[PDB]
C-alpha cells in the first residue's frame, strides 16, 4: 500500500484507497437501481467523486478475500 503513495507521488496524482473484500453484493460496487428505495451509487464512483480530476490513481486492496 505504501507503494501506492510512492507511485502516486512519482506521478503527482491523487491517491485514494478503496476498502473492498468485506463486500457481499454487486449493488455496492455499482449503485443499485434508482427504483429500489434509498438508491446510492457504487463505492467506485464515490471515490471518483472524492477526487477532483479525471485521472487519479486508485488502489484495489486484497481482492482475494446473496450477491
Amino acid at each position: 500500500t505504501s507503494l501506492g503513495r510512492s507511485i502516486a507521488r512519482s506521478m503527482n496524482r491523487k491517491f485514494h484507497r478503496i476498502s473492498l473484500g468485506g463486500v457481499r453484493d454487486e449493488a455496492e460496487i455499482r449503485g443499485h437501481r434508482r427504483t429500489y428505495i434509498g438508491a446510492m451509487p457504487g463505492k467506485l464512483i464515490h471515490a471518483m467523486k472524492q477526487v477532483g480530476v479525471i485521472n487519479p490513481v486508485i488502489l484495489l486492496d486484497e481482492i482475494d478475500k446473496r450477491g
Binding site: S19, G21, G22
Partner: protein, 71 residues
Amino acid sequence: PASAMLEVLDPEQNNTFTDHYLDVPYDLSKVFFITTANTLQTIPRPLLDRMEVIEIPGYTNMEKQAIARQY
C-alpha cells in the same frame, strides 16, 4: 457508513464539513475520541490500521473481593 465516521475520526476533513441537514461549514476538529471495542475481527481493516490496540486481561476472584468491598 465507514467513510461517514472516518470523516469524523480524522479532524482534517471536518474543517468545512457540512451535514446533509445543516449544510454549513463547521469545524469538528477539537474532539479527540478514545473508544472501546468488544470485537475486533469485524472492524474494517482501514479502521484497525489507524488505531492502537490495548487489551484488558480480565479479573480474578481475589481482585473481585477487594473491588466489591472497596468500590
